[PDB]
Amino acid sequence: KNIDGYFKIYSKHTPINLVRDLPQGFSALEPLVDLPIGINITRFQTLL
């Protein structure tokens, strides 16, 4: 998320065995990184 010129990153990792879908359950994401970058953002893309 991008707020007041800060780009904030949260994340978590979990073991799974369900290939098909997101698992039905709960676990929260911790803050990892916070970038004071000031960019106006409207679009994004992902690296393979």
Place this chain on the structure above:
Amino acid sequence: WNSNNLDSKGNYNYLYRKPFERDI
């Protein structure tokens, strides 16, 4: 502070046009 003793010449190298947003 005033920088008339540093940045004046006049000097045209300084230019102008929001909350921590640049205007490139």
